[PDB]
Amino acid sequence: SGFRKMAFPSGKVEGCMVQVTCGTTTLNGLWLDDVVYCPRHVICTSEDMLNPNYEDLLIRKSNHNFLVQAGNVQLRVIGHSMQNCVLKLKVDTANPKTPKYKFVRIQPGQTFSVLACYNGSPSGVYQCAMRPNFTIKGSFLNGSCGSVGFNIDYDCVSFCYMHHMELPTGVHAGTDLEGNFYGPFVDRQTAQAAGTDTTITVNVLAWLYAAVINGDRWFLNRFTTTLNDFNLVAMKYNYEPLTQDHVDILGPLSAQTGIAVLDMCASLKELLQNGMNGRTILGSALLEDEFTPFDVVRQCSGVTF
Amino acid sequence: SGFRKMAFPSGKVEGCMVQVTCGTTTLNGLWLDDVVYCPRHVICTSEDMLNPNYEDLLIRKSNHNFLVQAGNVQLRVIGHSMQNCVLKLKVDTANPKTPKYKFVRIQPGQTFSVLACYNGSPSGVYQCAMRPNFTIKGSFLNGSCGSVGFNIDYDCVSFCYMHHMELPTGVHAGTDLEGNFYGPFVDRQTAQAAGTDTTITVNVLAWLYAAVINGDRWFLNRFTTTLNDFNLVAMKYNYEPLTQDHVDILGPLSAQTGIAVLDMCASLKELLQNGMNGRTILGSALLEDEFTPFDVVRQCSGVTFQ
Numbered sequence: 001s002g003f004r005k006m007a008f009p010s011g012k013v014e015g016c017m018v019q020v021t022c023g024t025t026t027l028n029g030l031w032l033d034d035v036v037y038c039p040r041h042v043i044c045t046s047e048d049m050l051n052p053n054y055e056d057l058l059i060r061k062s063n064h065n066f067l068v069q070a071g072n073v074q075l076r077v078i079g080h081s082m083q084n085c086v087l088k089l090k091v092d093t094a095n096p097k098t099p100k101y102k103f104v105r106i107q108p109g110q111t112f113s114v115l116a117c118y119n120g121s122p123s124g125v126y127q128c129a130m131r132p133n134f135t136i137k138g139s140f141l142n143g144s145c146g147s148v149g150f151n152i153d154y155d156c157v158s159f160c161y162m163h164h165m166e167l168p169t170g171v172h173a174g175t176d177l178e179g180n181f182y183g184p185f186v187d188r189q190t191a192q193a194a195g196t197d198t199t200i201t202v203n204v205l206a207w208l209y210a211a212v213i214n215g216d217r218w219f220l221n222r223f224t225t226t227l228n229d230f231n232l233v234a235m236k237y238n239y240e241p242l243t244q245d246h247v248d249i250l251g252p253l254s255a256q257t258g259i260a261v262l263d264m265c266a267s268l269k270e271l272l273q274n275g276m277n278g279r280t281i282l283g284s285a286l287l288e289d290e291f292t293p294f295d296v297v298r299q300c301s302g303v304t305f
Numbered sequence: 306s307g308f309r310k311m312a313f314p315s316g317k318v319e320g321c322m323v324q325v326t327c328g329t330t331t332l333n334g335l336w337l338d339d340v341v342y343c344p345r346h347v348i349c350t351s352e353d354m355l356n357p358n359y360e361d362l363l364i365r366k367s368n369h370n371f372l373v374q375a376g377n378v379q380l381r382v383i384g385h386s387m388q389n390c391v392l393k394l395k396v397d398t399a400n401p402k403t404p405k406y407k408f409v410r411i412q413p414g415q416t417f418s419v420l421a422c423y424n425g426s427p428s429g430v431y432q433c434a435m436r437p438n439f440t441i442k443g444s445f446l447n448g449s450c451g452s453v454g455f456n457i458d459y460d461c462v463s464f465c466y467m468h469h470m471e472l473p474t475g476v477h478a479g480t481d482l483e484g485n486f487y488g489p490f491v492d493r494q495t496a497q498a499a500g501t502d503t504t505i506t507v508n509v510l511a512w513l514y515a516a517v518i519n520g521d522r523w524f525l526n527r528f529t530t531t532l533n534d535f536n537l538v539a540m541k542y543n544y545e546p547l548t549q550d551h552v553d554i555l556g557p558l559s560a561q562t563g564i565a566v567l568d569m570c571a572s573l574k575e576l577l578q579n580g581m582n583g584r585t586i587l588g589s590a591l592l593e594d595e596f597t598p599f600d601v602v603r604q605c606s607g608v609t610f611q
C-alpha cells in the first residue's frame with residue numbers, strides 16, 4: 001500500500017552527466033558513447049543571448065574552446081556540430097558507462113524523471129509531467145541547463161527532455177534530445193511566457209483509480225455519464241477533453257477495480273461541480289494530474305529495472 | 306525556481322541491491338563490502354510470524370541454505386549472524402561498487418530517500434520522512450522488504466532505514482542498519498498499530514520559508530507569538546511541540562528571508578485557524594511537513610525573490 005510521486009532509479013543517467021564550459025559560460029552535458037549533448041546557448045555570452053546568430057557564433061569556435069569535464073577527468077573535444085537547439089561535441093573517449101538508450105519526443109500529459117545537475121554533478125531526482133502548455137513545473141536554479149528528463153523500460157533509458165530555461169512564472173522549458181523545443185519557445189532572452197494551462201483529465205482519472213486501489217472510495221456514486229456530457233463539464237473547468245483513446249488507455253485500471261471509465265467520469269464530474277467537502281484523496285486536497293495510467297499500473301504492480 | 310519533493314540520485318545504492326532467498330521466501334538485501342544485510346524475517350514461514358523464535362529458526366540453517374543473487378551472478382554465503390532484527394550474510398565476494406558509506410539512526414521529522422526494490426531490482430525512488438509516530442508513509446508492495454532509505458550529503462551514503470513491514474493503516478515500519486526498529490514495533494505478526502500521528506511543525510515552518518524564498522508572502526501577518534502560546538495552539542491541531550532546538554535550526558532560513566521564527570509561527574497559527582481560502586503555497590492546498598530546514602536550504606536558491 002501507499003502512493004507517492006515516484007521517479008525512476010537515476011544510476012544509468014548519473015553515469016552520463018558531464019560539465020561543459022565555453023568561455024565563462026558553464027552548464028551540464030549528456031555523454032553517450034563518444035558524443036556530449038548540451039544546450040547550444042553554452043556558446044553565448046550574456047550580451048549574445050539578447051539576439052544570437054548561433055551559426056555565426058559557432059563558426060568562430062574551435063574544438064579546444066570547449067572544456068568538457070567528466071568527474072575529475074578532462075575529455076578532449078575532437079569535433080562539433082549543431083542539431084536544432086542542441087550542440088553535439090565529439091570527444092576522444094567513449095563513455096564506458098553508456099547505457100542502452102533511445103531519444104524519444106513525448107506528448108503533453110506524459111510524465112518523466114528529471115535528474116537535476118549542477119557543474120556536471122547530479123544533485124537530485126524528481127518526477128514531473130509535460131504540461132498541456134508544453135512547460136514543466138520543475139525545480140531548477142541557474143546552472144541546471146543541460147539536466148535531462150527520462151523514462152526507463154527494462155534496461156533502456158528513453159531520454160525525452162534537456163533543460164534550457166525558466167519562464168517569468170517560475171515554470172520551465174526545454175527540448176527533446178534532437179534539440180526541438182517543447183512549446184512555442186526560442187533560446188533567446190526575449191519576452192516569452194507560459195500560455196494558459198489546463199488539467200490533464202486522463203491523469204486525474206488514473207489517480208482516482210489509484211485512490212480506489214488504495215482504499216479511498218468515498219467519491220464513487222451510482223451515476224454514469226456519456227463522453228460528450230462529461231466533456232461539456234470538463235471544458236468549463238479548464239480540463240483537457242477526454243477522448244476515446246483516453247478511455248481505452250484506462251482499460252486495465254478499469255478492469256483491476258471493476259469500475260467502468262464513464263462511471264469514474266461521473267465521480268470526477270461531481271467532484272468538479274461540488275468539491276471534496278473537507279475530504280482528501282490519497283492525502284491531497286487537490287485533484288492530482290501528474291500520474292499517468294501507466295504510472296499508476298507500474299507503481300501498483302512493482303515493475304523493476 | 307520551483308519546489309519539488311526531491312530524492313537523492315540513487316545510483317550509489319542501486320549498485321548495492323541484491324536478492325536474498327531462503328526456502329520459498331525471497332526479499333532484498335544490501336551488499337556492502339563482503340556483507341549482505343537483510344531483514345531477519347527472510348528465515349520465517351507465514352506461520353512462524355505469529356510467534357517466531359529467530360534463534361531456533363536460524364540454528365537449523367546452514368550457509369548454503371541462503372541464496373544471494375547480485376544481478377545474474379550467484380554470491381556464495383560463507384557465514385551468517387543475527388544483529389537485532391537484521392541478518393548479516395558474509396559472502397565470498399566484496400561488492401566492487403561499494404560506495405563510501407555510514408550507518409546512521411535518524412530522529413522523527415528527518416527525511417530520507419527510499420529506493421523501492423523487488424527481487425533485488427530497483428523499481429523507483431521517492432522522498433519520505435520518519436513520522437513522529439516512528440512509521441513512514443511509503444509506497445511498498447509485498448516483496449519490497451530489504452529496500453533501504455538513505456541520504457547522500459556530499460559523496461557518502463548515510464543508510465538510515467531498512468524496510469520490514471506494513472501496518473494495518475497502510476503505513477510502514479522498519480529498522481536502522483543495525484537492526485533496531487524505529488518505534489515500539491516488533492518483527493512479529495502481533496496487534497501492532499501506529500500511535501496517533503502528528504504534524505512535524507519545524508518542517509511546516511521550513512516549507513513556509515521555502516515559499517517566501519520562491520517569492521510568496523500572502524500568508525504572513527503583523528503579529529508575533531511566544532513559544533509557549535504557539536505550542537498551546539499547535540497541539541490543539543495535532544502539531545508537534547516546537548522546541549528551542551527547532552527555533553535554532555530555522556535560524557539560517559529566518560536570516561535569508563528577514564522573518565523571525567516566532568513571526569513565522571504567528572503566520573502558521575493564522576493558517577491553521579483560517580485555511581488557505583482558495584490559495585495554494587508552492588502548489589499545495591495542504592501544509593506540507595516532509596521537507597526539513599536542511600532540505601529547503603539544499604533545494605532553494607540562496608537569494609530570496611523579494
Ligand SMILES: C[C@H]1CN(c2cncc3ccccc23)C(=O)[C@@]12CN(S(=O)(=O)CC1(C#N)CC1)Cc1ccc(Cl)cc12
Nearest residue numbers: 041140141142144145164165166167168186187188189306
Ligand atoms: C542562461 C539561461 C539560464 N536560465 C535558467 C534556467 N533554469 C532555471 C533558472 C533559474 C534562475 C535563473 C535562470 C535560470 C535561463 O532561463 C537562461 C537565462 N535567462 S533569464 O535569466 O532571463 C530566466 C529567468 C526568467 N524568466 C530568470 C529566470 C534567459 C534565457 C533565455 C533563453 C534560454 Cl534558452 C536560457 C535563458
Ligand SMILES: C[C@H]1CN(c2cncc3ccccc23)C(=O)[C@@]12CN(S(=O)(=O)CC1(C#N)CC1)Cc1ccc(Cl)cc12
Nearest residue numbers: 001346445446447449450469470471472473491492493494
Ligand atoms: C513478511 C512481511 C511482508 N510485509 C509487507 C511489507 N511491506 C509492504 C507490504 C505490502 C503488502 C503486504 C505485505 C507487506 C509485512 O508487513 C510482513 C507480512 N505481514 S502482513 O502481510 O500481515 C502485512 C499487512 C498488514 N497489516 C497486509 C499488509 C506481517 C508482518 C509482520 C511483521 C513483519 Cl517484520 C513483516 C510482516
Ligand SMILES: [Cl-]
Nearest residue numbers: 410411412415
Ligand atoms: Cl536525524
